[PDB]
Write a protein that binds this ligand. Structure first.
Ligand SMILES: *P(=O)(O)OCC(C)(C)[C@H](O)C(=O)NCCC(=O)NCCS
Length: 89
């Protein structure tokens, strides 16, 4: 897990940026925020894939992928771990 704090900040900042993301239990299943799994996922995959040019086929989309931030961290780290100071819309 590299820059794991950025991953929580990346997802948490999108939902609650007025709250310190490092002060949020990053152990919460993003499923509650599943709102991003469909509407945000379409925008994130289209924008995120374009930014790194990663084909969606490389990874399958499913609710289990958002079950926990740690699970996603492994898939992202296994392919690419891009650290960012803040989430870009
Ligand atoms: P949302 O809560 O409608 O997304 C829920 C899940 C993740 C179950 C979604 O239906 C799914 O099967 N996975 C992602 C599908 C997808 O490509 N989303 C973009 C347009 S819905």
């Amino acid at each position: 897990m590299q820059h794991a704090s950025v991953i929580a900040q990346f997802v948490v900042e999108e939902f609650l940026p007025d709250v310190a993301p490092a002060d949020v239990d990053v152990d919460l299943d993003l499923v509650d925020n599943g709102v991003i799994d469909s509407l945000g996922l379409l925008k994130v995959i289209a924008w995120l894939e374009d930014r790194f040019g990663i084909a969606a086929d490389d990874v399958e989309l499913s609710p289990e992928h958002f079950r926990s931030i740690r699970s996603i961290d492994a898939f992202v780290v296994g392919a690419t771990t891009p650290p960012v100071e803040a989430k870009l819309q």
